Symmetry: C3
């Protein structure tokens, strides 16, 4: 069975290489998991900052409009001065944006 | 003896390797779905921020129309404020839409 | 023990197939990595564009406030007309946003 014993040694070597490949593959998956978590964290933190900025901007523009409305009183009002543009607003989407950020942060 | 026993150990080693491959294929499966979920939530968040910033720009510009009107009798916005009068807001809504569309795409 | 030659034959087949599965898997992981990089790149570019828009909107709104401040002086000032809301501002978070974008782009060198 001299032929057989040679093949068995070959198969053992081949198996050893396969095990090492599988081990490397698991390290690569671990690393990819780490990267995905890291990107999610960085996305979440950025969206949180932009959400703060856009909410503060909306509030500040609305206060700017209150002043403008006051000023346009003697002129007959904002709608008479600007036309229908007067009724254009800024929808508050803070809750909707916070909702997506919360789902992103689930993977931290 | 020796040869039947070596085959026995090889067979169980192959079983375990096949199981590990099956487990790795599931792990990669779940990773594909987690990456797609991230991309989808990113795109949805960006779409909302697109809407908010676009509306903010429009609203601010309408405020400026009112301000230009009111400053007319004082010599106009540029005379009153100086060169800051010319500072604008670049409309980047198409640029942002295009990025969102890229994130949403597969294949 | 002619069965032995044949158990061996089946083991050699199985190994061949396992090798192909491994090649295929390394490819799938490579595709996942590239996909992850693509998303990072797209995220960073979208965030940069929103950084620009939000920065300009803050600047433009503050200028609108300067005009308003001028206009309200003769009614005794913005704070008199608006009340304490006059002091509400827009925090400049551009450095903070830019740092986070930079970290996304920075990861694209490893
Ligand atoms: Cl404004």
């Amino acid at each position: 069975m001299k032929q057989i014993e040679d093949k068995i040694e070959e198969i053992l070597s081949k198996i050893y290489h396969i095990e090492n490949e599988i081990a490397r593959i698991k390290k690569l998956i671990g690393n990819l998991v780490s990267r995905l978590r890291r990107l999610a964290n960085q996305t979440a933190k950025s969206l949180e900052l932009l959400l703060r900025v856009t909410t503060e901007e909306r509030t500040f523009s609305l206060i700017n409009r209150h002043a403008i409305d006051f000023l346009l009183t003697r002129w007959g009002g904002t709608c008479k001065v600007l036309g229908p543009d007067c009724s254009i607003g800024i929808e508050d989407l803070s809750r909707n944006i916070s909702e997506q950020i919360d789902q992103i942060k689930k993977d931290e």
